[PDB]
Amino acid sequence: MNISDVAKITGLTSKAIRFYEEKGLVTPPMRSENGYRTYTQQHLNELTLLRQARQVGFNLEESGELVNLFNDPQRHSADVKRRTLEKVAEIERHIEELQSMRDQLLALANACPGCPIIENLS
Amino acid sequence: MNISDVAKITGLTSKAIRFYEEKGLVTPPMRSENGYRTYTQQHLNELTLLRQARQVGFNLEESGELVNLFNDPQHSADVKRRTLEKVAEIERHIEELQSMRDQLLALANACPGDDSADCPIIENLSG
Numbered sequence: 201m202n203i204s205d206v207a208k209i210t211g212l213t214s215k216a217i218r219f220y221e222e223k224g225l226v227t228p229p230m231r232s233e234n235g236y237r238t239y240t241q242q243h244l245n246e247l248t249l250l251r252q253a254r255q256v257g258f259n260l261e262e263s264g265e266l267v268n269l270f271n272d273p274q275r276h277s278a279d280v281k282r283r284t285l286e287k288v289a290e291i292e293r294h295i296e297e298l299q300s301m302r303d304q305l306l307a308l309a310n311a312c313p314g315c316p317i318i319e320n321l322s
Numbered sequence: 323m324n325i326s327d328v329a330k331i332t333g334l335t336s337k338a339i340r341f342y343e344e345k346g347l348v349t350p351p352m353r354s355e356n357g358y359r360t361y362t363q364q365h366l367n368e369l370t371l372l373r374q375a376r377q378v379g380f381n382l383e384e385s386g387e388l389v390n391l392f393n394d395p396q397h398s399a400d401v402k403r404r405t406l407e408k409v410a411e412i413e414r415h416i417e418e419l420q421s422m423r424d425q426l427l428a429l430a431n432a433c434p435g436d437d438s439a440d441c442p443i444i445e446n447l448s449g
C-alpha cells in the first residue's frame with residue numbers, strides 16, 4: 201500500500217499521515233526498492249487508532265501514547281481505562297461549556313421579536 | 323481614545339485590533355494630527371460585539387457580518403435567524419460530544435481495567 205491508498209482507507213489526508221510520521225507518533229513507513237513509502241496493516245491500525253483518538257479529544261501526545269499501548273503486547277488495560285475515564289471528564293466539561301453558550305444564545309433569541317441580540321452582544 | 327485605551331477597555335491586544343481593522347471587520351478609525359488612530363464609542367461597540375460574538379460561537383466571517391448588521395440603521399429577523407442557526411450548530415456539536423462520551427463509557431464498562439493486555443477500548447479505537 202502506498203500513502204494514497206492508506207489515505208483513502210483511513211480517511212486521513214496524505215498531509216496528516218506524513219505529519220504523524222514526522223512527529224514520530226506511528227511506526228515509520230517502509231521504503232520500496234524505488235524509494236517510495238509503503239505500508240502494512242500494522243500502519244493502518246496505528247493510523248486508524250490515531251484518527252479516532254483525535255476525534256474523541258486526545259491531544260497529540262495522548263494519542264501517541266495510545267499507539268504505544270496498542271503496540272505493547274504487555275499493556276495493562278487499566279492504564280488505557282484510566283486515560284479514557286480522564287478523557288471522558290474532559291468531554292463533560294466541554295459539553296457544559298457549549299451548553300452555557302447555547303443557553304446564552306437562546307436567552308438572547310427568545311428576547312428578540314425578530315434587536316436584543318446585537319445590542320447586548322455589542 | 324487611542325489604540326491602547328481600546329485594548330484595555332475591550333480586553334483585546336492592540337495587535338488584534340489592528341488585525342480586525344486590516345481585515346476590514348471593523349470601521350477604520352480616523353487619524354489624529356500626528357497620524358495616530360483615534361477611536362470613537364462606535365469602534366468600542368464594534369470591537370466588543372466582535373469579541374463577544376466569537377466567544378459565543380460565531381467565526382470571524384460570521385462575527386464580521388454581525389458588525390455589519392449592527393451599524394445598519396434598519397434586521398431583527400435576519401439576526402435571530404443567524405443566532406438560531408448557530409445554536410443548531412452548537413447543539414449538533416453537543417450531540418456529537420455526547421455520542422463520543424457515551425462510546426468511550428460503553429467501552430470502559432467493557433474494559434477489565436486490570437493488568438491483562440486484553441483491552442476493548444484500544445481494540446475498538448483502532449483496527
Ligand SMILES: [Cu+]
Nearest residue numbers: 312315316398
Ligand atoms: Cu434580534
Ligand SMILES: [Cu+]
Nearest residue numbers: 277433441442
Ligand atoms: Cu481496556
